[PDB]
């Protein structure tokens, strides 16, 4: 039987660059059990019937775990362009799977702030699909050799979310799992 | 290689910074003015200093890119708006010394006392007592007294330490690239843009006197009323062919005419329009007066309030033992965060200012995607202007009756809409020349026109031309009285009050058109029509990304300010008060004297 209740019931999740995967295979997978958790901002699926999702069959499932913000859930999807799709988690043209994503103000949340969930903001090229980024060299823009040092024209690469409880609506922290399946 | 790039990622870095920093000040102040304790001034000072410094580092490096190499106009607003240092051009020494006088100019102000006569004691300070003699007494001589002790208090000890500020400021203003500091002031309606688009500096002081010369038909008819009503008052010291005397006027300054209603009413005997007792016969509370401004808000077609706005927000005043400021305002902390703090009664005049605070919510809100440097309004003149139009169309009477106030038997009459239009012209027309004349004196002392040895000269002599107002008693130099008003002792900017008063016309017309009104303007209500909010909507979202002029042209249709919809509102009252002063005379000749 496939642990799906350990990814969607994760106590902790990881940042969005260094992002967590999973692979889930050789079990039989109740995909009724992802309507059991709470209401979800949004469940958008490509390719795949829901209704039709326990009525097929699949060789491997790959889950992708991730926290990001509310304005920034929309970029989750194929083709479009923006700062997390094209520096830290790029997605397939034909991808082939689901999307769940829900608001987790509560738990990830406090009053001083959350300074451990960070993001990459800089990046020389764009991603190929499902690629994972760790380095954290300092970025280049100019012609003088930044010599490993936060000087002038020299940018350090990540930037924290100031995770705080009084913010909005579309700032608040929320929690996204996406399934790829595989068929060969 | 190239500025272009080097100044996004400056920009990008900057913007994802400076969101924290701005956010944690705003909740220490909030902190601050919800419950007042020492731990908490504390807090206020630790985040202020710390914005302060990041700021002036960031604005330390920015300097480093030129900007006329810029050809992108987006990221040239937001670069340009950043090089801006201040006072930190200056000298070390010289940064110190206009500190201290700024320090010295306002402590006066706010400690300035005087004597009482036949006893030592009933020393009366400015806000708590002489507020209430000039708005309630009538007599002659207190008032002379008062207006008279007032200005050799304060005036007296402010005239040397405004010596040394204009020079201060004067070579502030010539060490960053600005012809005086007026032109520093100047430099907020500056806008670039297409070849039609393109207002200098140099073009603001043309725009004034032309849009004042078609208010001054109006205001010499209104003046010329209230003379008269002042001769029932004080038989014998009015002069039929002359101006009118500074203490008399229902404020220690002569800024307002609100004061003087209960003397000048044109049918005393019909009682105003008052609701209050019927918001109390119904049952009304502190939220329900939010709750129905939010209908209001969402009936037009603009968004509802968030979830949150309910749950941080003080809407009354708190009853666990905790000391408030208590004055209303409204709050945009950043990041999906919006509060308005007041203390709210079952006034009408709270049901009013509800909506006008709330105004400032929906406009902070409409540009909350707008990069962060771009944050504010066009101009100065446009975040009160958007939201006293709600208050205007939120008074009419039809507007009362749908909601529930009102029964259908109220019919409205003639006398009640001159009585009305009367009121609103007293506060908002007696306003425009003091305004216009304060804020030209200034501009021609910043440049050095009037020497030292001739400002009181001046004022007082345009003070008549203008205005239409004589100085009670004699005085020669060593009085200041300029120095006396709250924004002339703390350097603050005048201009805004001029412009607002022109642009919440401009638009009230303008929104009239839109929703098909047919009428008379001043009881217009733009209730349940949306096509006026999306004409609102295109504004709204703006911000500072574009040239005021669009923003403008977006909702008027014009490109710059016009009188006529001014002079639209007040149209019967114009008649009524031509036809009132058939035999009399209007006008002012500037030779009589009331101390002769
Ligand atoms: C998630 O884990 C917690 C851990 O105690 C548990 O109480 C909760 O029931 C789990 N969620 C569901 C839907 O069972
Ligand atoms: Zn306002």
């Known amino acids: 039987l496939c642990p799906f209740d350990e990814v969607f019931n994760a106590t902790r999740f990881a940042s969005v660059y260094a992002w967590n995967r999973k692979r889930i295979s ?61 520096y830290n988690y790029k997605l397939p043209d034909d991808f082939t799977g689901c999307v769940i994503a829900w608001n ?32 954290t060299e300092i970025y280049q823009a100019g012609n003088k050799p930044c010599n490993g040092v936060a000087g002038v024209n020299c940018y350090f690469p990540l930037q924290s979310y100031g995770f705080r409880p009084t913010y909005g609506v579309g700032h608040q922290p929320y929690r996204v799992v996406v399934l790829s399946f595989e068929l060969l | 290689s190239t500025i272009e790039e080097l100044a996004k990622t400056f920009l990008e870095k900057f913007n994802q910074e400076a969101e924290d920093l701005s956010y944690q000040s705003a909740l220490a102040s ?69 500190n201290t006088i700024l320090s010295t100019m306002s402590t006066i102000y706010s400690t300035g006392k005087v004597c009482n006569q036949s006893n030592p004691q009933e020393c009366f300070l400015l806000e708590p007592g002489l507020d209430e003699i000039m708005a309630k007494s009538t007599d002659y001589n207190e008032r002379l007294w008062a207006w008279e002790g007032w200005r050799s208090v304060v005036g007296k000890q402010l005239r040397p330490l405004y010596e040394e500020y204009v020079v201060l400021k004067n070579e502030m203003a010539r060490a960053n690239n600005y012809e005086d500091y007026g032109d520093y002031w100047r430099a907020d309606y500056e806008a670039e843009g297409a070849d039609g688009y393109d207002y200098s500096r140099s073009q603001l002081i043309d725009d004034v006197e032309r849009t004042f010369s078609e208010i001054k038909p109006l205001y010499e008819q209104l003046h010329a009323f209230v003379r008269t009503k002042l001769m029932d008052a004080y038989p014998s010291r009015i002069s039929p062919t002359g101006c009118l005397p500074a203490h008399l006027l229902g404020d220690m300054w002569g800024r307002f005419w609100t004061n003087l209603y209960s003397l000048t009413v044109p049918f005393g ?42 749950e941080n927000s003080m809407l009354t005043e708190p009853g666990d033992g905790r000391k408030v400021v208590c004055h209303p305002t409204a709050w945009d902390l950043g990041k999906g965060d919006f509060r308005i703090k007041m203390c709210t009664k079952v006034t009408m005049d709270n049901f009013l200012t509800a909506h006008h605070e709330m105004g400032h919510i929906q406009y902070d809100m409409a540009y909350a995607t707008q990069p962060f440097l771009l944050r504010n309004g066009a101009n100065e003149g446009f975040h009160e202007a958007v939201g006293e139009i709600m208050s205007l169309s ?96 703390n350097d603050y900017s005048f201009i805004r009050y001029y412009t607002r008063t022109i642009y919440q016309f401009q638009f009230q017309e303008a929104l009239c058109q839109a929703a098909q009104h047919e009428g008379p303007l001043h009881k217009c209500d733009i209730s349940n029509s949306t096509e006026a909010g999306q004409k609102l909507l295109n504004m709204l979202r703006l911000g500072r990304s574009e040239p005021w002029t669009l923003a403008l042209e977006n909702v008027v249709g014009a490109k710059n300010m016009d009188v006529r919809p001014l002079l639209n509102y007040f149209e019967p009252l114009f008649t009524w008060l031509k036809e009132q002063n058939r035999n009399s005379f209007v006008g002012w000749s500037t030779e009589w004297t009331p101390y002769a």
Not at chain 1, 29 to 34: G, N, R
Not at chain 2, 40 to 62: G, H, R
Not at chain 2, 283 to 301: N, Q, T
Request: hydrophobic share 35%; aromatic share 14%; with cysteine.
């Open chain 2, 269 to 310: 005997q019909k009682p105003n329009i008052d609701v209050t007792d019927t918001m109390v016969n119904q049952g009304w509370d502190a939220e329900r007066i939010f709750k129905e401004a939010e209908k209001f808000f969402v009936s037009v077609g603009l968004p509802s309030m968030t979830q949150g706005f309910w």
């Open chain 1, 26 to 86: 050789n079990c039989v997978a109740d995909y009724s059990v992802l309507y059991n958790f709470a209401p979800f901002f949004a469940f958008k699926c490509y390719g795949v019937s829901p209704t039709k999702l326990n009525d097929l069959c699949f060789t491997n499932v790959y889950a992708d775990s991730f926290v990001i913000r509310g304005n920034e859930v929309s970029q989750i999807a194929p083709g479009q362009t923006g700062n997390i799709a094209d």
């Open chain 1, 104 to 135: 987790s103000n509560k738990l990830d949340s406090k009053v001083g702030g959350n300074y451990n969930y960070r993001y990459r903001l800089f990046r020389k090229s764009n991603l190929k699909p499902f690629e994972r980024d760790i380095s």
């Open chain 2, 30 to 98: 909030w902190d601050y003015n919800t419950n007042i304790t020492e731990e908490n001034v504390q807090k206020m000072n630790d985040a202020e200093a710390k914005w302060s410094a990041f700021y002036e580092e960031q604005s330390k490096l920015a300097k480093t890119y030129p900007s006329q190499e810029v050809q992108n106009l987006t990221v040239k607003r937001q670069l340009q708006a950043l090089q801006q240092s201040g006072s930190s051009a200056l000298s070390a020494d010289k940064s110190k010394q206009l």
């Open chain 2, 394 to 489: 939120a008074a009419t009477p039809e507007h009362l009756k749908s909601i529930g106030l009102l029964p259908y038997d109220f019919h409205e009459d003639n006398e009640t809409e001159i009585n009305f239009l009367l009121k609103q012209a007293l506060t908002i027309v007696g306003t425009l020349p003091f305004t216009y004349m304060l804020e030209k004196w200034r501009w021609m002392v910043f440049k050095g026109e009037i020497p030292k040895e001739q400002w009181m000269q001046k004022w007082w002599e345009m003070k008549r031309e203008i205005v239409g107002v004589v100085e009670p008693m004699p005085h020669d130099e060593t009085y200041c009285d300029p120095a006396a008003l709250f924004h002339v002792a």
